[PDB]
């Protein structure tokens, strides 16, 4: 659509036999490292190298490391507000 460069998007990840299967590092403007191509991570629409800003509404700019984990783990599926860039624009 309109407005290109930097846009935010929410990804809904569900819990499976293998779990979420995704790697993420960093605080506040959290950044996703990699995701399981054959798992909830990829199935939910997550790509390698994303900028996760929020998780299930609860922003990642207050909750501690174990805190964010407990929040995400506290539930089968969860939505994550992340940001990326248009590849080849």
């Amino acid at each position: 659509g309109s407005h290109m460069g930097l846009v935010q998007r929410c990804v809904i990840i569900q819990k499976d036999d293998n779990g979420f299967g995704l790697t993420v590092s960093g605080d506040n403007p959290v950044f996703v490292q990699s995701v399981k191509e054959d798992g909830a991570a990829m199935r939910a629409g997550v790509q390698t190298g994303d900028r996760i800003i929020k998780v299930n509404g609860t922003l990642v700019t207050h909750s501690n490391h174990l805190e964010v984990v407990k929040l995400i783990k506290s539930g089968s599926y969860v939505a994550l507000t992340v940001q990326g860039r248009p590849p080849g624009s």
């Binding site: 995704l22 790697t23 993420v24 590092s25 964010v68 995400i72």
Partner: peptide
């Protein structure tokens, strides 16, 4: 180096 990484 980095004390804020989480893998799930």
């Amino acid at each position: 180096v980095e004390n804020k990484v989480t893998d799930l």
